[PDB]
Symmetry: D2
Subunit: 249 residues, 4 copies
C-alpha cells in the first residue's frame, strides 16, 4: 500500500489551505505562488505521509514553500563580483510544516538563511561545525552558536534516522524571538512539534536560492555559471531527487 | 520658533507607539530595537515636523526603523569574495512613516532593497536610470522598471523640493502586492500619503546595511574594509548629517 | 456512491485546519472548542460535499463553527424578565465557510445576529420581510434594509434550490465594513463565493443561541423554559435534522 | 499647573494612533468611529494624565473606546418584553488602555459584558458580590467567580484609591484565554500593567450600552423608557460627569 504519489485532491487541499493560512498571516502570496511546485515531498517513500494525512502527526519529510522573492541582486555589482554573486541575492519565502513533519537534513554551499517564526514553534536541528570545501580557504566571523542538546523523544522518519546523526545542536524558536541565522555550509533540518495544534509557519529570509526546479526551468540566468547551479545538498540521497518534482495523480 | 530638537516625551510617544504598532502586525521587535536611534529626523530643519506633530500630515523628512536583522553573511565565503562581501548580507527591518512624511531622496552603492507593505500604502519615487561608478564596469540583468509619472499634487518638504528632481518614476505599493525591488545605485525616496488614516508600515528585506551610526559604533567589523563604511548617500546634504543621531532634549 | 458520512481523516483535516486558520486570525479558540460538533453538514445528502472535497467549489450546505461564548446573561435580571430572557444573552463565534458552500436558509424566533467578516467575502441572502408569530404583537424599530437583488449566476445546492426562493435580498460583506445586523424572525443564508482563494471567515456576535445539540446535551438550564428550547428553524427539512450531529466514520 | 483639558494635538495623536493600532489588529473601525468622543478622561483632575503623557506609566483614569456596534435588538420582540429590552441588545467595541491607566470602578444595572484581550494583558478588579436593587427580586444562575486577591503593589490614581476598596477580586486576562464575563450589577474596573510595552487592547462584547452622551444625543429611542437612560454608574463622583465629554482646547 506504500503510496507512490499524492492525489490531485490531497495536493490541492494541502496547498490551498496553506496559502489561505499564509494570507491570514499577512504574507504576500500571489496567484502564481500557489502552484504544483509549492507542496514538496522529499522522496517516493515519503508519500506515505498521505496514507494517514498531514494531521496524523507522523514523522515524514514534506513541506510547503511559498516564495515571494528570489532576487539575484546582480544589477549594480562590479564585474569583479561575478564569481561571488551566487553567494548573495535575496530570497523571501513562507514555509509551512505540519505536526511531526520535517524539512530534512541538508546544507547549502552558498545560501545563508534566517528564520522568523510566524505561527507555531520551530525545532531546528543542526551541526555547529561548518563543512569544508576542498582546496578553498573560507572566511569566518560569527560562526554558529553551539545551542542545546536534542530534547528527549524526537521521532524521526522511518529509514532516514541516520541522516540526522551529525545535526547534534538543537534550538526551539518561537514567534517574537530574535531572528535566527543559519550560516551556509552548516547541516540543518527542522520540524513542527508533533503535538502542535497548528502547522509551523516560518518566514525565511536568505541569500539567493539556486534551484534548477520544474517551476524554475525556463528563466534567464543573470550570470552564466548560475545556469543549472544547485545549492541544496540533502544528506539523504532519496531526498535530493524527489525534491525537484511532486507526483500528483 | 524653528524646532532644533525633539523632547523626550515627543520621542518616546512616537517610537513606543510605533513599536506597539509593529508588534500588533507581528513584526518581531525585541527590547533592544526600541531605542533612541529608532526615530530618525533627516536634518535640523526637519525637527519642525514636531511643531504640529506626526499626524499633521505636513511634508517633512523623518521616519522610524526597527531593524531585526543585519547579517554580514561573511561566514562560509571563499576568501576571494572578501572585497565583494559588502554587497551581500541580509538586513530585515520594519519602517514606519507617518502621513505626508518621507524617507528622503538617496541611493546606495552596495545595498539592494525590496519592499513589502504591511499597513497603509507606499508611494515610491525613483530614477529608473542607475548611477555610474567612475572607473568600474558594472553588471546588468533586470535593471529597474520605468514605472509611471508622478501623480498630481505631491507636497514636498520646504527647502528640499530640488532633491527629488531626478526621481522621475513613481509606483504606489499596497499590502499583498508582489515584492518590489530597488536595485543598488538607484536614487529613491518614498512617503506615506498625507490623507492616510494609518502610518505606512513597510517591511524591507535588503542586503547588508553599512551605517556607522551611534547605535552602531561599538561592534566588530567582519571584514577590515567594512569598518566606517557608509552606504547611504542622501541627495540633500542636510540629510546625511542629522541622520546619524536624533537630538532629544 | 452518494456519501452518507465523513471519514475521521476528512473531518479532522477540515476542522483542525480551520481551527489553525482561526488562531492565525487571532480568534480565541480553546481546546474544547475543537471537537466533533464543530464541523456541520446539513443533511445526509450534503455529505457528498466530501466526494470532491471542501476546495471543489461545489454548492453544498456545510460549515464550521467555533463558539467562544454563549452566555445566558440571566444573572442580575429582574424576575419579571424570565420569559423574555431567551431573546437576550451573548453568543460569540467564528464561522468558516469554504468556497461555494452555504450556511443554509433558516431563521430564528429569538436570536438576532451581527456579522464581521475577518477573511474572504460573505454573500448574504435574506428576506427583508420579518416573519409573523401567530397571536403575538411584536416591536419594530429599525427593521431590515432592503439590500440589492441577487447577482447573476449563483449556484445553489442540488435539491435545495427552492429553500432560497424567499431570501430575495442580497448584500456582499467584506473585512472592514460596518457591522451587519440580521434581526431575529428574518430568513437568511450566506455563502463564500466559489472563486474565493480563501475560506470565508466571519465573526458572529448575536444573542443567546438555543441549540439542544450533542455537544450541548449535558449543561444546566438557567431558566426552566430554555431546556430543550430550539431556535434554529431551517427552511429545508433535511437540514434541521442532520444539523444536531455529524456522522464520522 | 494641574491640566484642565487636552490640546487638539494631544487628543488627535492619542486617538488617531489608537485607531491605527485597532486597524492593525483587524478591528473594523470606520471613519465615524474616530471622533472627539472616542478618547475619554474620567474627571477634570484626570487631565493631568497628559502632563507627562500616555506613555508615562502613571496611574490615571482614561481610555479610548471605538464602538462598532450598539444594536437595541428590539425588532422581533414580543411587546411584553418592552420593559426588559434594556437588558439585552448587542454592543461590540474595542477599548484601548495605556500602561498604568484605568477604566475606573463602576457598575451597570443592565449591561453584562465579556472581554477578549487582543493585545497586551488586562488586569480586572471586581466585586464577586452582586449589588442589590431595592424592591426587586433578581435571577441567579452562574454568578461571578471569586478570582484571586490583588497582586502586590498596584498603583491607584491619586485621590481615587478609595473607589477601588470593594473591588476585592482580581484576574489577569491574556490573548487566547476563554472569554471572561462581567455580569451586570457587579462593581468592576481594569487597567493595563504599568510595565507593558504595548497598550492594552480589548474587545468587549456586551448587551446594549445605555449612554446619553454627546456623540449620542441625537438618535431615535427604540423604546420610550430608553430615552435619557443611563447605565454606567461610577463609584467616584468625579468620574460620572467628565465622562460624557472630553475638553479639547
Ligand atoms: O491556486 C492555483 C492552483 O492551486 C494549486 O493546487 C495549483 O495546482 C494551482 O494550479
Ligand atoms: O487528525 C487526522 C487523522 O488523525 C490521525 O491519526 C491521522 O490518521 C488522520 O487520519
Ligand atoms: O523601550 C526602550 C526605550 O524606549 C525608547 O524611548 C528608548 O528611549 C529606549 O530607552
Ligand atoms: O491631527 C493632529 C493635529 O492636527 C494637525 O493639524 C496637527 O497640527 C496636529 O496638531
Ligand atoms: O483537537 C481536538 C480534537 O480534534 C477534532 O478532530 C475533534 O475530534 C477533537 O477530538
Ligand atoms: O482543488 C481541490 C480539488 O479540485 C476540485 O475540483 C475538487 O474536485 C478537489 O478534488
Ligand atoms: O479621524 C476623524 C477625526 O480624528 C479625530 O481626532 C476626531 O477629531 C475626528 O474629527
Ligand atoms: O516615555 C514617555 C515619557 O516618559 C515618561 O516618563 C513620561 O514622562 C513621558 O514624558
Ligand atoms: O543522538 C541524538 C540524535 O539521535 C542524533 O541523530 O543527533 C544527536 C542527538 O543528540
Ligand atoms: O527553499 C528552501 C529554504 O531555502 C530552506 O528551507 O532550505 C531548503 C530550501 O532551499
Ligand atoms: O516634476 C515632478 C517632480 O516635481 C520632480 O521632482 O520629479 C518628476 C515629477 O514628475
Ligand atoms: O535602513 C534604511 C533602509 O535600508 C532604506 O530605507 O534605505 C535607507 C536606510 O538605509
Ligand atoms: O430569483 C433569485 C433566486 O433564484 C431566488 O431563490 O431568490 C431571489 C433571486 O433573485
Ligand atoms: O450558530 C449559528 C449562528 O448563530 C448563525 O449562523 O445561525 C445558525 C447557527 O445558529
Ligand atoms: O486591599 C487591596 C486594595 O487596596 C483594595 O482597594 O481592594 C482589595 C485589595 O486587596
Ligand atoms: O462602553 C464601556 C464598556 O461597556 C465598559 O468598559 O463599561 C464602561 C463603558 O460603558
Ligand atoms: Co536550508
Ligand atoms: Co534606501
Ligand atoms: Co442564523
Ligand atoms: Co463596565
Amino acid at each position: 500500500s506504500a503510496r507512490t504519489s499524492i492525489t490531485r485532491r490531497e495536493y490541492d487541499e494541502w496547498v490551498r489551505e496553506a496559502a489561505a493560512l499564509g494570507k491570514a498571516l499577512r504574507y504576500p502570496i500571489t496567484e502564481k505562488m500557489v502552484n504544483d511546485s509549492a507542496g514538496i515531498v522529499f522522496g517516493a517513500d515519503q508519500y506515505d505521509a498521505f496514507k494517514n494525512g498531514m494531521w496524523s502527526g507522523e514523522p515524514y519529510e514534506a513541506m510547503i514553500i511559498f516564495e515571494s522573492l528570489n532576487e539575484p541582486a546582480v544589477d549594480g555589482l562590479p564585474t569583479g563580483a561575478a564569481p561571488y554573486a551566487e553567494y548573495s541575492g535575496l530570497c523571501d519565502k513562507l514555509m509551512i510544516v505540519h505536526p511531526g513533519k520535517f524539512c530534512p537534513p541538508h546544507h547549502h554551499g552558498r545560501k545563508t538563511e534566517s528564520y522568523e517564526v510566524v505561527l507555531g514553534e520551530m525545532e531546528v536541528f543542526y551541526s555547529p561545525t561548518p563543512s569544508a570545501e576542498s582546496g578553498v580557504e573560507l572566511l569566518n566571523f560569527s560562526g554558529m552558536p553551539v545551542g542545546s542538546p536534542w530534547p528527549e523523544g524526537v521521532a524521526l522518519p522511518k529509514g532516514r534516522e541516520s541522516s540526522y546523526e551529525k545535526l547534534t545542536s538543537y534550538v526551539r524558536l518561537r514567534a517574537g524571538d530574535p531572528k535566527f541565522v543559519m550560516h551556509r555550509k552548516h547541516l540543518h533540518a527542522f520540524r513542527c512539534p508533533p503535538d502542535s495544534d497548528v502547522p509551523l509557519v516560518v518566514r525565511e529570509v536568505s541569500t539567493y536560492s539556486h534551484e534548477p526546479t520544474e517551476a524554475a526551468a525556463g528563466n534567464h540566468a543573470p550570470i552564466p555559471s548560475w545556469l543549472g547551479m544547485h545549492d541544496n545538498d540533502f544528506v539523504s540521497d532519496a531526498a535530493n531527487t524527489g525534491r525537484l518534482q511532486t507526483a500528483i495523480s
